[PDB]
Design an enzyme around this catalytic site. Structure first.
Site, short mmCIF file in Angstrom:
data_model
loop_
_atom_site.label_atom_id
_atom_site.label_comp_id
_atom_site.label_asym_id
_atom_site.label_seq_id
_atom_site.Cartn_x
_atom_site.Cartn_y
_atom_site.Cartn_z
N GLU A 84 0.70 -1.12 -0.07
CA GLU A 84 -0.10 0.01 -0.17
C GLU A 84 0.69 1.34 0.07
OE1 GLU A 84 -3.43 0.05 0.33
OE2 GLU A 84 -3.72 -2.26 0.21
N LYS A 121 10.82 6.81 1.31
CA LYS A 121 10.94 6.25 2.44
C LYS A 121 11.36 4.78 2.22
CE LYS A 121 6.03 5.93 1.26
NZ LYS A 121 4.54 6.10 1.71
N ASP A 153 8.44 5.71 -7.71
CA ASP A 153 7.53 6.72 -7.47
C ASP A 153 7.81 8.24 -7.42
OD1 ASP A 153 5.25 4.47 -5.39
OD2 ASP A 153 5.44 4.66 -7.63
N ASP A 202 8.17 11.98 -1.28
CA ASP A 202 7.56 11.09 -0.41
C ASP A 202 8.60 9.81 -0.32
OD1 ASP A 202 5.81 10.15 1.51
OD2 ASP A 202 4.63 8.95 0.01
N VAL A 224 0.36 -1.02 -4.92
CA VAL A 224 1.00 -1.76 -6.01
C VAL A 224 0.89 -3.29 -6.06
CG1 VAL A 224 3.40 -1.86 -7.16
CG2 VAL A 224 2.93 0.12 -5.21
#
Ligand SMILES: Nc1nc(N)nc(-c2cc(Cl)ccc2O)n1
Length: 294
Positions: A12, A125, A141, A123, A18
């Protein structure tokens, strides 16, 4: 779609789920990300479609951008494991410093490339950093926040990770710079070394205060303009800065020095990906192969 044979749901993401899937006709295994669903900014599909041109060894290749039934699907080359899973799997022993060093070097190369092309992640991570058996690591992403705009959640009651968010974002800055990605990477670097998240906040204010408790509450001396930021409150407690040696033990001084430059409060003082690649910490960098259990 019926073009695939969907192997499994992979995870998620902030911008969508995904999936791992195989093309029924070509047989290629790919990663399929599904975005949210009443239309979606068409100006965004154009911007995202532009990302298909990005080609770099440390950026996961975006193969296709599909718009159907008001849904947006991104088709990416597939990698078998994400860094979060790898770190968890390496928690007892820790990731060897030479591998941590290799991964950081590669990630900075990827960021340097994206940033030079005016593309930001925003974003970053552990979950969107992917690794393969040959020692490579790639960022996935990129540019979704710039094209779509960071919403409230993923798509359906999800707990967004605040742990890697830059202080200027938490303080309500309206304009972001490439520095936000260096901050996130700095936090990930620290995590690989200590095997524990650096700033595991459970709320936006807890996130901010955990940063303050470690790096010291920022002021106009270290960060000109900070007291004028949108969400700045003169009532913030004033914590003193802790020694870095306490932050990421037992990382050596080259590593600590590099991390401190990646974690400067002032986005303007924060080191760039290109400058970081020249840091002495990378003088002896190599490319070890990881022990991956797939
Ligand atoms: N969590 C997770 N795990 C695996 N193995 N792959 C991914 C993945 C995600 C994107 Cl966006 C693109 C390609 C990918 O391989 N994500």
């Amino acid at each position: 779609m019926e073009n695939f044979q969907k192997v499994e749901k992979i995870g998620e993401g902030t911008y969508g789920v995904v999936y791992k899937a195989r093309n029924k006709l070509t047989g290629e295994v790919v990663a399929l990300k599904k975005i949210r669903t009443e239309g979606v900014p068409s100006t965004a599909i154009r911007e995202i479609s532009l990302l298909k041109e990005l080609n770099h060894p440390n950026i996961v290749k975006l193969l296709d951008v599909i718009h159907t039934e008001n849904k947006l699907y991104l088709v990416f080359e597939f990698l078998h494991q994400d860094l979060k899973k790898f770190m968890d799997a390496s928690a007892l022993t820790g990731i060897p410093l030479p591998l941590i060093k290799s991964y950081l070097f590669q990630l900075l190369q990827g960021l340097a490339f994206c940033h030079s092309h005016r593309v930001l992640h925003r974003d970053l991570k552990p979950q969107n950093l992917l690794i393969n058996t040959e020692g490579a690591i790639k960022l996935a992403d990129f540019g979704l926040a710039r094209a779509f705009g960071v919403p409230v959640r993923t798509y359906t009651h999800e707990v967004v990770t605040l742990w890697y968010r830059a202080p200027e974002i938490l303080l309500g800055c309206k304009y972001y710079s490439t520095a936000v990605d260096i901050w996130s990477l700095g936090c990930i670097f620290a995590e690989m070394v200590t095997r524990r998240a650096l700033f595991p906040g459970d709320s936006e204010i807890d996130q901010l205060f955990r940063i303050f408790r470690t790096l010291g509450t920022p002021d106009e001396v270290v960060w000109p303009g900070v007291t004028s930021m949108p969400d700045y409150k003169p009532s913030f407690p004033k914590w003193a800065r802790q020694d870095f040696s306490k932050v990421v033990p037992p990382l050596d001084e080259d590593g600590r020095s590099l991390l401190s430059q990646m974690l400067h409060y002032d986005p303007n003082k924060r080191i760039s990906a290109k400058a970081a690649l020249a840091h002495p910490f990378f003088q002896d960098v190599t490319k070890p192969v990881p022990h991956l259990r797939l």
